[PDB]
PDB file of N, CA and C in Angstrom:
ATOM      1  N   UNK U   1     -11.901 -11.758 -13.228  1.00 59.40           N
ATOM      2  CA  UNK U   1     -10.984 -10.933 -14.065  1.00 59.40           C
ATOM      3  C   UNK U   1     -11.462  -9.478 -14.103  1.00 59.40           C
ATOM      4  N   UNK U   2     -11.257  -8.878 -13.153  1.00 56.37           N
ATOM      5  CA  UNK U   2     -11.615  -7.672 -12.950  1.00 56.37           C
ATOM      6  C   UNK U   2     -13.339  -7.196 -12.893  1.00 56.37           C
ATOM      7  N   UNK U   3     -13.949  -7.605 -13.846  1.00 57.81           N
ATOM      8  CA  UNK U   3     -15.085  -7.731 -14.181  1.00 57.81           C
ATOM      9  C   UNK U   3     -15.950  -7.796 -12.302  1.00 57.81           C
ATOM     10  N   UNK U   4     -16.775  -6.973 -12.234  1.00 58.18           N
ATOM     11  CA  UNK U   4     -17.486  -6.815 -10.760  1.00 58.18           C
ATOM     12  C   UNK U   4     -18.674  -6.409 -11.283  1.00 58.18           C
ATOM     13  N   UNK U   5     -19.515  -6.780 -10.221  1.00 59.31           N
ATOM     14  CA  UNK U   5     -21.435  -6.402 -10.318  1.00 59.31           C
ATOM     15  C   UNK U   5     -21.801  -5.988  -9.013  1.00 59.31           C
ATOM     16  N   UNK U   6     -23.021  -5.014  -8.908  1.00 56.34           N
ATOM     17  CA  UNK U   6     -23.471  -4.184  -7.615  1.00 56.34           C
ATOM     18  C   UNK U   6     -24.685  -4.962  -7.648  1.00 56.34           C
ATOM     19  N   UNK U   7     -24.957  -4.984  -6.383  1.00 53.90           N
ATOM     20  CA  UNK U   7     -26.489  -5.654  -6.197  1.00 53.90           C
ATOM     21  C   UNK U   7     -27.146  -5.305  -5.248  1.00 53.90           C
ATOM     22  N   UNK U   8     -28.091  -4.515  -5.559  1.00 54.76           N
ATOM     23  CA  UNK U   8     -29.272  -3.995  -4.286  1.00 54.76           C
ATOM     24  C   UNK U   8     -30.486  -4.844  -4.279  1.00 54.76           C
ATOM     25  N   UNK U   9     -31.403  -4.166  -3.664  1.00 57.50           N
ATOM     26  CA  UNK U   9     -32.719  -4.473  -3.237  1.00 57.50           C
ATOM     27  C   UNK U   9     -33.987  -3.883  -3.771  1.00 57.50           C
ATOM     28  N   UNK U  10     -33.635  -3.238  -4.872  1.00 60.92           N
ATOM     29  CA  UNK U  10     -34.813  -2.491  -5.243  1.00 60.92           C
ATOM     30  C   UNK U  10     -35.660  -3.221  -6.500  1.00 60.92           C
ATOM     31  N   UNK U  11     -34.948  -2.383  -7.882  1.00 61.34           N
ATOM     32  CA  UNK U  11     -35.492  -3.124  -9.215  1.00 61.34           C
ATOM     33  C   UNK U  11     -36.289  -2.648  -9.324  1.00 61.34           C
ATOM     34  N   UNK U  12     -37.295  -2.929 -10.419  1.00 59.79           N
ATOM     35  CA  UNK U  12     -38.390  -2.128 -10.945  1.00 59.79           C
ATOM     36  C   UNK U  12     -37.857  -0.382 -11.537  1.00 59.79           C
ATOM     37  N   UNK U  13     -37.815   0.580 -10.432  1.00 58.87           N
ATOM     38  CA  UNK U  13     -37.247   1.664 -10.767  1.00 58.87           C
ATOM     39  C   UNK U  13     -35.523   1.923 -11.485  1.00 58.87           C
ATOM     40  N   UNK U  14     -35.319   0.502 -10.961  1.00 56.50           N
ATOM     41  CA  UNK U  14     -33.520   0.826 -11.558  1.00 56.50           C
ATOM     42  C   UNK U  14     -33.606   0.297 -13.268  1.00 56.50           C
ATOM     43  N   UNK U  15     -34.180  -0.415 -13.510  1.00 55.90           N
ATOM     44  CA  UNK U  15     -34.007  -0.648 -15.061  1.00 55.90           C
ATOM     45  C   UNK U  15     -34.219   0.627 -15.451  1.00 55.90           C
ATOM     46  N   UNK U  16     -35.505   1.536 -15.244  1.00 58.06           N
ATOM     47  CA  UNK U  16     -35.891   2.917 -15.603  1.00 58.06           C
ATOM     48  C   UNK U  16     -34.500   3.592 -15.339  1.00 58.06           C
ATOM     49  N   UNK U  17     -34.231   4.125 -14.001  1.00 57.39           N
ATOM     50  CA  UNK U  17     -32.747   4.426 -14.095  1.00 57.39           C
ATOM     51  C   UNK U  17     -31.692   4.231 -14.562  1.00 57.39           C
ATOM     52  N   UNK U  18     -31.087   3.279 -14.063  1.00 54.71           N
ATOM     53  CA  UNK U  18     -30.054   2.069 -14.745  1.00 54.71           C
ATOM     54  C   UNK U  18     -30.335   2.730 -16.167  1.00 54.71           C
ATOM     55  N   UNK U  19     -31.265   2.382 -16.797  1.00 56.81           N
ATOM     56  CA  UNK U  19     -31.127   3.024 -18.405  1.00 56.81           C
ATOM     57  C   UNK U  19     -30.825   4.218 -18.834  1.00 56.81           C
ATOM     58  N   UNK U  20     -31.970   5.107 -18.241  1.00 57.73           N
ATOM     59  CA  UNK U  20     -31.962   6.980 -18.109  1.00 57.73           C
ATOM     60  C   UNK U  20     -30.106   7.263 -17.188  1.00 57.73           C
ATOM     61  N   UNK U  21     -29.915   6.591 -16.530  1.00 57.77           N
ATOM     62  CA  UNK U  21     -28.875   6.953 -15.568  1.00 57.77           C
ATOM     63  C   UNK U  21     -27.834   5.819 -16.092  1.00 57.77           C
ATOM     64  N   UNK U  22     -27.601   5.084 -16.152  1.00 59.34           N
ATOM     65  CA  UNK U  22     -26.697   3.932 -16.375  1.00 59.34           C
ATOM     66  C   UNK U  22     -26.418   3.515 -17.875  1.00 59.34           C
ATOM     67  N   UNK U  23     -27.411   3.349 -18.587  1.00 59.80           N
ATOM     68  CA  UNK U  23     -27.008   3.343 -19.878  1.00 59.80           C
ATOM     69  C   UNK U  23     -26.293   3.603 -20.758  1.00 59.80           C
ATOM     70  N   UNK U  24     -26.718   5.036 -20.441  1.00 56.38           N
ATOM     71  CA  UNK U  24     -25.189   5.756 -21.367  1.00 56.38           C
ATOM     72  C   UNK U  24     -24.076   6.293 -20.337  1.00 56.38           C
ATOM     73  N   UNK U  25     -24.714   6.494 -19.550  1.00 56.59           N
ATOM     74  CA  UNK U  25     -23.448   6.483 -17.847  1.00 56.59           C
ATOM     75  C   UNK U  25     -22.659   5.680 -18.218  1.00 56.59           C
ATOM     76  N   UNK U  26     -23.040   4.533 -18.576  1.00 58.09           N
ATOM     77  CA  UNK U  26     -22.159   3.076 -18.181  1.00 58.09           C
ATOM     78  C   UNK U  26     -22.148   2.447 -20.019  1.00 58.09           C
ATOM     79  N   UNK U  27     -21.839   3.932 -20.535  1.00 57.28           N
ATOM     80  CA  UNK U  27     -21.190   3.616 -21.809  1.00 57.28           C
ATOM     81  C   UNK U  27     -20.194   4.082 -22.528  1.00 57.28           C
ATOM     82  N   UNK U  28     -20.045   5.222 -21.626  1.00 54.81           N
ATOM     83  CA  UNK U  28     -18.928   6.195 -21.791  1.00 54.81           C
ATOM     84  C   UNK U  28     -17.541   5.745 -21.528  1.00 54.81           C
ATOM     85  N   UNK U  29     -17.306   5.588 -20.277  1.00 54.25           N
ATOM     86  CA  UNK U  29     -15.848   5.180 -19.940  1.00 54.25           C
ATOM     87  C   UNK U  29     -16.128   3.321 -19.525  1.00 54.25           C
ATOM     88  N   UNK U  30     -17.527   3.409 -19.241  1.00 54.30           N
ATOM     89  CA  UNK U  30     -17.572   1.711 -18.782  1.00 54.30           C
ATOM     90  C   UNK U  30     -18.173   1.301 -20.216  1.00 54.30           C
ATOM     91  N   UNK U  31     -17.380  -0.153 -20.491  1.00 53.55           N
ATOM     92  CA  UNK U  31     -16.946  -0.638 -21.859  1.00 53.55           C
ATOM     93  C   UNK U  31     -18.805  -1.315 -21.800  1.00 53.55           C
ATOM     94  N   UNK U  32     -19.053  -1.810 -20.861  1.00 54.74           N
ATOM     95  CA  UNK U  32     -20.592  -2.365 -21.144  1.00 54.74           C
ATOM     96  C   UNK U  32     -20.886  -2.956 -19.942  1.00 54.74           C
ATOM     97  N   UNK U  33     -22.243  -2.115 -19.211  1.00 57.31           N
ATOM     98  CA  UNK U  33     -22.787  -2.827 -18.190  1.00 57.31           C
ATOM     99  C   UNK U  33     -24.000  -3.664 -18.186  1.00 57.31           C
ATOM    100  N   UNK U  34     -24.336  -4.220 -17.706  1.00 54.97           N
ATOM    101  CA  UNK U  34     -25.066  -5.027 -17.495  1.00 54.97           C
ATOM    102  C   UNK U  34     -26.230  -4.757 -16.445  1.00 54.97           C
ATOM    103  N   UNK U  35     -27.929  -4.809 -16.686  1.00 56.59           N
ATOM    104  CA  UNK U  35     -28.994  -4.258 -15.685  1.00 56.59           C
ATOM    105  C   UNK U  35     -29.923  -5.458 -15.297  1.00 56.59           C
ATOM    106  N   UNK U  36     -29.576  -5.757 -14.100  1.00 51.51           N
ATOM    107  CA  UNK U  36     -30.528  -7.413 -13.525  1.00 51.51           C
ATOM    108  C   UNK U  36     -31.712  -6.670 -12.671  1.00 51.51           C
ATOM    109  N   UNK U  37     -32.642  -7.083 -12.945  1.00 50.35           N
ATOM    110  CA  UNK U  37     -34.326  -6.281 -11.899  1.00 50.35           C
ATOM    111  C   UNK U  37     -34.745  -7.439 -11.396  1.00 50.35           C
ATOM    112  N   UNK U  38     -34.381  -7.854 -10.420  1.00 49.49           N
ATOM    113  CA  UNK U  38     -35.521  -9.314  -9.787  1.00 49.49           C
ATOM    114  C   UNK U  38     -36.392  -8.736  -8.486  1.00 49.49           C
ATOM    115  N   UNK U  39     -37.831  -8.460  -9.010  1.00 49.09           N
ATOM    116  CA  UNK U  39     -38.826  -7.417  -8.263  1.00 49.09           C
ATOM    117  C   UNK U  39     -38.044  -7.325  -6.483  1.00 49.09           C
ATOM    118  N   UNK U  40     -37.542  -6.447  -6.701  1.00 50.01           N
ATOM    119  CA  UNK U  40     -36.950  -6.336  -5.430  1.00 50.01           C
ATOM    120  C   UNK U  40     -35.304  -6.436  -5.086  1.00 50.01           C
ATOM    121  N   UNK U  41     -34.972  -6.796  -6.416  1.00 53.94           N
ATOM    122  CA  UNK U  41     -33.586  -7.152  -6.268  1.00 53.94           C
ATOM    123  C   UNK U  41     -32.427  -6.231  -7.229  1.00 53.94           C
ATOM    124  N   UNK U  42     -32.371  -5.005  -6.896  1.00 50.35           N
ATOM    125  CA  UNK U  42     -31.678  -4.603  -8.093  1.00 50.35           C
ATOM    126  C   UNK U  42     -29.912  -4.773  -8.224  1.00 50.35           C
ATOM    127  N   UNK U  43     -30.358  -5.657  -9.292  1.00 50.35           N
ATOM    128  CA  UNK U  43     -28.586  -6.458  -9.451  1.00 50.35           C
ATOM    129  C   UNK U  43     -28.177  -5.734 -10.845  1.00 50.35           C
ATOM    130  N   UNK U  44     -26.694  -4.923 -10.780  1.00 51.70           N
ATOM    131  CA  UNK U  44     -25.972  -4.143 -12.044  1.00 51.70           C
ATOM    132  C   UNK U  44     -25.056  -5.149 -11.824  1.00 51.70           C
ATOM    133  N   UNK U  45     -24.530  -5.070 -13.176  1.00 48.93           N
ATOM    134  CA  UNK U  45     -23.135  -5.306 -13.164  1.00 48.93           C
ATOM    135  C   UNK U  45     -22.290  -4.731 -13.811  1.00 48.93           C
ATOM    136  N   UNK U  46     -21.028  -4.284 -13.685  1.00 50.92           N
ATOM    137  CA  UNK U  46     -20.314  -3.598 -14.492  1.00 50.92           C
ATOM    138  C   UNK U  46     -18.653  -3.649 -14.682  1.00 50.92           C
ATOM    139  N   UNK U  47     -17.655  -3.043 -15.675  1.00 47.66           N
ATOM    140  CA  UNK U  47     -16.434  -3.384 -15.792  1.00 47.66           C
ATOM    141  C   UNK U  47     -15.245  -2.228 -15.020  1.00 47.66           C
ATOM    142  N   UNK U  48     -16.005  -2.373 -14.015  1.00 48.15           N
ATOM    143  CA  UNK U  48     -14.875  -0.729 -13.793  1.00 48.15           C
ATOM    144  C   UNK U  48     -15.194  -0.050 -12.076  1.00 48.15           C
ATOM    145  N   UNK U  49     -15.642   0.500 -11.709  1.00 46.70           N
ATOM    146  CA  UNK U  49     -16.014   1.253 -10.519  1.00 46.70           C
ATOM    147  C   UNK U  49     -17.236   1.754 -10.288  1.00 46.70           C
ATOM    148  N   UNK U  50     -18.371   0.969  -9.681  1.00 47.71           N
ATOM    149  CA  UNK U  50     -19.666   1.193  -9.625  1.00 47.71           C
ATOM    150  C   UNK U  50     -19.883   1.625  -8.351  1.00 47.71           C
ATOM    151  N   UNK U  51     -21.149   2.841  -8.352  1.00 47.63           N
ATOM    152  CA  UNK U  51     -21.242   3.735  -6.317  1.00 47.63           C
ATOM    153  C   UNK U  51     -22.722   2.580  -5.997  1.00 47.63           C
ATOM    154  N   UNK U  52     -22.657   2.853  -4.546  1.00 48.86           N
ATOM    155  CA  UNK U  52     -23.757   2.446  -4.286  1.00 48.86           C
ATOM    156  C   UNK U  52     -23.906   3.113  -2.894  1.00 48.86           C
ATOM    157  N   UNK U  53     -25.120   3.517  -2.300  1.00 47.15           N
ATOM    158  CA  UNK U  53     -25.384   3.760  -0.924  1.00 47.15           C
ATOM    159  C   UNK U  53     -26.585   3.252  -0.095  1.00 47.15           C
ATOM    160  N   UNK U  54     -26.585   3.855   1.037  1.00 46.89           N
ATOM    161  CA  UNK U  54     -27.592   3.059   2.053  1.00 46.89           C
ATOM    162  C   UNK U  54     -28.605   4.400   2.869  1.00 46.89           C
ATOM    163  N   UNK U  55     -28.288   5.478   2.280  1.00 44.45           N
ATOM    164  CA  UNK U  55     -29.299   6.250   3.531  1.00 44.45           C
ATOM    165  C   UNK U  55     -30.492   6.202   2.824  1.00 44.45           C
ATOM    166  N   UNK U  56     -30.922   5.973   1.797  1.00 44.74           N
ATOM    167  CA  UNK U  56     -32.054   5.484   1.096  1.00 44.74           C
ATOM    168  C   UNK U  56     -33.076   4.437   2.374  1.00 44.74           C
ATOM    169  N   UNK U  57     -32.303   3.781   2.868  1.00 43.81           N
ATOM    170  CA  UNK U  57     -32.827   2.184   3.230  1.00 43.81           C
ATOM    171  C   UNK U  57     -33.193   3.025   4.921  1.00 43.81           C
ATOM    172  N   UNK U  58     -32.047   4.280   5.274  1.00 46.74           N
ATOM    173  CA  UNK U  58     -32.893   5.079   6.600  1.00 46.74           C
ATOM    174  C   UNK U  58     -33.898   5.956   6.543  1.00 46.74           C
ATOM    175  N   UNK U  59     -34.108   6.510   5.296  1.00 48.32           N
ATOM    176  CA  UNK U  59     -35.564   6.731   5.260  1.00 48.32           C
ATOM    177  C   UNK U  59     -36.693   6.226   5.129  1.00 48.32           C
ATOM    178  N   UNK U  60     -35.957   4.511   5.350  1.00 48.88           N
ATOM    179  CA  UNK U  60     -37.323   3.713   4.665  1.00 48.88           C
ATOM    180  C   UNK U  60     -37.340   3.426   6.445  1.00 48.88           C
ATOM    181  N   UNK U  61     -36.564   2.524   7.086  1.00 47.90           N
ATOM    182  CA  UNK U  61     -36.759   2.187   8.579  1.00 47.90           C
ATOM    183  C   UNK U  61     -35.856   3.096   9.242  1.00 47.90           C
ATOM    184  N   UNK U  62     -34.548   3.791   8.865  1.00 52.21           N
ATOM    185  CA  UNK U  62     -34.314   4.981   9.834  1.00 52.21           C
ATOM    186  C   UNK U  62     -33.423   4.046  10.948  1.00 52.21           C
ATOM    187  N   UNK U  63     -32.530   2.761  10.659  1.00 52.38           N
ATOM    188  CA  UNK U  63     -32.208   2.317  11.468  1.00 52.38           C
ATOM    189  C   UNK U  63     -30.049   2.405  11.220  1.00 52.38           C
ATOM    190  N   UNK U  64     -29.849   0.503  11.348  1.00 53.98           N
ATOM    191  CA  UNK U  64     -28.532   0.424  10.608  1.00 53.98           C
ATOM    192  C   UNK U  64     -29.056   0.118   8.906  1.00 53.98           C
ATOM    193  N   UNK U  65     -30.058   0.344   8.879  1.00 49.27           N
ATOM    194  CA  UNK U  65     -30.323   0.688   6.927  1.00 49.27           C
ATOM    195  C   UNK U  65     -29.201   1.063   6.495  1.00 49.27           C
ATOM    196  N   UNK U  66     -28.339   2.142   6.932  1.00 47.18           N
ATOM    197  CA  UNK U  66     -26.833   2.118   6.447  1.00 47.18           C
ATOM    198  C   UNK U  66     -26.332   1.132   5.829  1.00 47.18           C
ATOM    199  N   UNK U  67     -26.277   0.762   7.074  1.00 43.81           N
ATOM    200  CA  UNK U  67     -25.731  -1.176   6.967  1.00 43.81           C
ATOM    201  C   UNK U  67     -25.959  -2.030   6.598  1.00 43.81           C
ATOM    202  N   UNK U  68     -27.371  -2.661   7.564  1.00 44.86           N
ATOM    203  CA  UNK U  68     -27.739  -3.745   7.661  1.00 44.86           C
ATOM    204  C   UNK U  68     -28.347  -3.499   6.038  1.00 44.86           C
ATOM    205  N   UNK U  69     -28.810  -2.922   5.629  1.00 41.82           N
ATOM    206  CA  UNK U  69     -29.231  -2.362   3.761  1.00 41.82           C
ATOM    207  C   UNK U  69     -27.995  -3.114   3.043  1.00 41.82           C
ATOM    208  N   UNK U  70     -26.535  -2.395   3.329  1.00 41.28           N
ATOM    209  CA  UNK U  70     -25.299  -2.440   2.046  1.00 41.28           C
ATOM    210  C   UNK U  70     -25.605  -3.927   2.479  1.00 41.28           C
ATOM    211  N   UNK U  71     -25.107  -4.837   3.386  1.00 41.31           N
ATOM    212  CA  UNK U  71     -24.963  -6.059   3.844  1.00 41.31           C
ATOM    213  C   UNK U  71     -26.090  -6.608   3.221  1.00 41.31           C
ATOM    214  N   UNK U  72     -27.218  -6.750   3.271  1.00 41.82           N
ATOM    215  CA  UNK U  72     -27.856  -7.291   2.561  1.00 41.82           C
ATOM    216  C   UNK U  72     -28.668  -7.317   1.063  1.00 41.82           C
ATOM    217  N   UNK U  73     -28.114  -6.051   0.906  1.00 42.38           N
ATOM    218  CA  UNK U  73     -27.921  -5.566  -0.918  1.00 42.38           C
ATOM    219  C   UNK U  73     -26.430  -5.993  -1.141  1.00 42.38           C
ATOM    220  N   UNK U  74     -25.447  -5.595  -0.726  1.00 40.91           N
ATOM    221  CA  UNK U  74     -24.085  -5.588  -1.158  1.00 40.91           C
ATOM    222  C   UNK U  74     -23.717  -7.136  -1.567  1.00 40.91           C
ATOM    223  N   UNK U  75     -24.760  -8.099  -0.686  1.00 37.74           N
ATOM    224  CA  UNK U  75     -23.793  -9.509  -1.173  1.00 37.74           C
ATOM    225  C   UNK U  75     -23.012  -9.711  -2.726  1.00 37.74           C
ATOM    226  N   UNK U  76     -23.335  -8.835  -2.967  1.00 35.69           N
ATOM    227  CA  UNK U  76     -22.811  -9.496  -4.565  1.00 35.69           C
ATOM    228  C   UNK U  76     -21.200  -8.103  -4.332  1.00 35.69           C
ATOM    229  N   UNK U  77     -21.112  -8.067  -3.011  1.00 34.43           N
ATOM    230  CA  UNK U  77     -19.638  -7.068  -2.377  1.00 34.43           C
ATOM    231  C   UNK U  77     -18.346  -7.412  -3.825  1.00 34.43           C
ATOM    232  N   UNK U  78     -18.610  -8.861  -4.243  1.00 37.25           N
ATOM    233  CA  UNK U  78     -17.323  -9.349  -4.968  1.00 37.25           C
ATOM    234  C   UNK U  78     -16.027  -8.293  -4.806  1.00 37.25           C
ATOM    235  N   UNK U  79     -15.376  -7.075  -5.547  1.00 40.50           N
ATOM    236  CA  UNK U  79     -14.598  -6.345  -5.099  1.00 40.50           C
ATOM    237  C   UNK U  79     -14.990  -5.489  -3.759  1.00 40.50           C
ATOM    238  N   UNK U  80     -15.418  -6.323  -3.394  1.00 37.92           N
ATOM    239  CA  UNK U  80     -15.796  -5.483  -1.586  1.00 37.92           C
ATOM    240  C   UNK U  80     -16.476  -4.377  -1.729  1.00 37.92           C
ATOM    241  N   UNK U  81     -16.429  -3.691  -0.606  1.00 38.68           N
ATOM    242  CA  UNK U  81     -16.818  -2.148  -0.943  1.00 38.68           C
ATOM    243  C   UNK U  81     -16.368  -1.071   0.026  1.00 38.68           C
ATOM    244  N   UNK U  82     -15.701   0.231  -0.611  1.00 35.57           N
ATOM    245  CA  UNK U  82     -15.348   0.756   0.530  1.00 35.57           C
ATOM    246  C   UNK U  82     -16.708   1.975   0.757  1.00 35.57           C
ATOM    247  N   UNK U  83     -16.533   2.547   1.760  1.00 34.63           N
ATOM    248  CA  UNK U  83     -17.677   2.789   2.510  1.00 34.63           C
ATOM    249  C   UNK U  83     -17.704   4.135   2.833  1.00 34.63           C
ATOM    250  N   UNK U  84     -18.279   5.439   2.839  1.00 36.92           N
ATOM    251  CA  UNK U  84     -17.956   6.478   2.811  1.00 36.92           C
ATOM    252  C   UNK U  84     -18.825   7.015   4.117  1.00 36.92           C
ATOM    253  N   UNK U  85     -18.957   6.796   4.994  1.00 40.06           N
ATOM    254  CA  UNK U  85     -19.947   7.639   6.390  1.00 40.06           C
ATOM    255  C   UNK U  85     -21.123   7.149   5.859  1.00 40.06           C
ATOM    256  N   UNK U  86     -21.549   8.213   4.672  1.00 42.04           N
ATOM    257  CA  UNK U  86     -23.068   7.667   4.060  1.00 42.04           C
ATOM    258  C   UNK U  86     -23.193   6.794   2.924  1.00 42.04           C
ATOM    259  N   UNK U  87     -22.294   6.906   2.275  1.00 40.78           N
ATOM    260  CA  UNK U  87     -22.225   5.984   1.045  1.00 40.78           C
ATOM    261  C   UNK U  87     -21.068   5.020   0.634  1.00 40.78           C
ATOM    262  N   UNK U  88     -21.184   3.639   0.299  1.00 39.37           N
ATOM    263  CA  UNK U  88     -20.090   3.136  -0.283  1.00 39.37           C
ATOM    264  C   UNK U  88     -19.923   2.867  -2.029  1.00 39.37           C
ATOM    265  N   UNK U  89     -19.257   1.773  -1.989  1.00 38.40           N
ATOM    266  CA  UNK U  89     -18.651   2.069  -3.641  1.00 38.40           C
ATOM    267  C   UNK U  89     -17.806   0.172  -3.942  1.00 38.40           C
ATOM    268  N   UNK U  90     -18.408  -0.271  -4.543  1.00 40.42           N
ATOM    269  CA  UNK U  90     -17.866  -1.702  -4.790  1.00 40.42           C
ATOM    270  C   UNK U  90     -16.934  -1.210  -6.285  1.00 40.42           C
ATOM    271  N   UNK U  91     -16.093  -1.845  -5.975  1.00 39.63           N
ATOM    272  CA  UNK U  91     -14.774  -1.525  -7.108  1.00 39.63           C
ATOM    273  C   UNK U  91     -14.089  -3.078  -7.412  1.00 39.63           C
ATOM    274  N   UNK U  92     -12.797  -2.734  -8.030  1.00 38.64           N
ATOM    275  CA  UNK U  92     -11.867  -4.159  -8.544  1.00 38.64           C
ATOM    276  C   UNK U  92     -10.641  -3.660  -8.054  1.00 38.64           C
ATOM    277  N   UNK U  93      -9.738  -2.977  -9.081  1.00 40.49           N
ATOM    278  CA  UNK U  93      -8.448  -2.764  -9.233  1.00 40.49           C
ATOM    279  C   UNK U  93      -8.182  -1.453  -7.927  1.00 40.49           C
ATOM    280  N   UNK U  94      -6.833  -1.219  -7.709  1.00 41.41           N
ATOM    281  CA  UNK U  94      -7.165  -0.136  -6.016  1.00 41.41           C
ATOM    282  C   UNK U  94      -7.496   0.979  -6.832  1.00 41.41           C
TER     283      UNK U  94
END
């Protein structure tokens, strides 16, 4: 029911973020998000239109980190994600 969650690979630093950055980010127009840290796994969830990107993951190996990064952070894609050259964006409604 509209309701979607982003899920990367990081954690640890995103609760710090996620809070400093997401907290009240994601209190303003988003009704209440949600911050999952599984050491390595950084899983949000939220009610509305959440960004996410991958050139992070090419400075780490410099490869399809683009990609092969969203694809294996993105599984939690649920409203898919559209994809911007460098960055994509998992959403719900168009």
């Amino acid at each position: 029911s509209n309701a979607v969650v982003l899920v990367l690979m990081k954690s640890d630093e995103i609760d710090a973020i996620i809070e400093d950055i997401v907290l009240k980010g994601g209190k303003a127009k988003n009704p209440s998000i949600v911050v999952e840290d599984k050491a390595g796994f950084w899983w949000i969830k939220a009610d509305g239109a959440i960004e996410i990107d991958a050139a992070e993951a090419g400075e780490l190996l410099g490869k399809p980190f683009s990609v092969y990064d969203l694809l294996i952070n993105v599984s939690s894609t649920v409203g898919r994600a559209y994809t911007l050259g460098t960055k994509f964006t998992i959403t719900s409604e168009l």
